[model samples]
Target: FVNQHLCGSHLVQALYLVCGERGFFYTPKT
Candidate 1:
């Protein structure tokens, strides 16, 4: 789900930030 950018702290350890008309949060992938 990356379609746009987000705003917020990198709250998750070893996580990624992504947003698209959505909230700011970490949802990392390997």
Candidate 2:
């Protein structure tokens, strides 16, 4: 198991899904 760091509680889950196995980060703009 590995640990990950995230910012903004509102998007943590979304980030996790977006991250996938690589554990990346991204911000969506409207």
Candidate 3:
């Protein structure tokens, strides 16, 4: 997961949870 919208919603959502437990990217819709 990197750069722009190359990632995804549900995909990022997965990373969000995993990374959440380990600290993560500041990615939230505005």
Candidate 4:
């Protein structure tokens, strides 16, 4: 469970970075 959580966290961060670079529309919910 812990490993899965960590993987998800990293994936989200990576996706955020990618979106930022491409100027993709990604409004993260607060």
Candidate 5:
């Protein structure tokens, strides 16, 4: 479902903006 939703809005770009392989990790599991 997530992929589908994101795909509509360019998933790759979204992913790259949010969590690309740029040595950045956002742990939203607090």
Candidate 6:
């Protein structure tokens, strides 16, 4: 469970960075 949580956190951070680079239209659901 701990590993899964950590992986998810990393994914969310990466997604945020990507979206930020693109524009503000792609907001994360979380």
TM-score of each: 0.17, 0.35, 0.37, 0.51, 0.33, 0.52
**Ordering by TM-score:** 6, 4, 3, 2, 5, 1
Error of 1 at 8 (Å): 13
- What Cα-based lDDT does every candidate model obtain? 0.38, 0.58, 0.67, 0.66, 0.56, 0.66
For candidate 2, the TM-score is 0.35
Could you list the CA RMSD of all candidates, in the order they appear? 11.1, 9.4, 6.2, 4.8, 5.6, 4.5
Error of 4 at 2 (Å): 1.0
Superposition error at 28 for model 1 (Å): 0.4
lDDT of 5: 0.56
Model 3, 1-30: lDDT tens digits are 354465566667788788887866755665
Instruction: Kindly report which residue pairs in candidate 1 clash with one another.
Output: none
Write the number of the candidate with greater TM-score, choosing between 1 and 5: 5
Model 6 misplacement above 4 A: 21-30
Clashes of each: 0, 0, 0, 0, 0, 0
lDDT of 6: 0.66
Against the hidden true structure, what lDDT does model 4 obtain? 0.66
Q: What tens-digit string does per-residue lDDT give for candidate 5 at 1-30?
A: 766665645745566677856744433323
Candidate 6: residue 6 Cα off by (Å): 0.8
**Which lDDT tens digits does candidate 2 get at residues 1-30?**
223233355476777887778885555442
Higher-ranked by lDDT: 2 or 4: 4
Tens-place lDDT digits, model 6, residues 1-30? 677677767777777888876654433345
Write candidate 4's Cα lDDT for 1-30 as tens digits: 677666767777878888876654434342
Tell me how candidate 1 scores on lDDT: 0.38
Candidate 3 segments exceeding 4 Å error: 1-7, 21-30
- Clashing residue pairs in candidate 5, if any? none
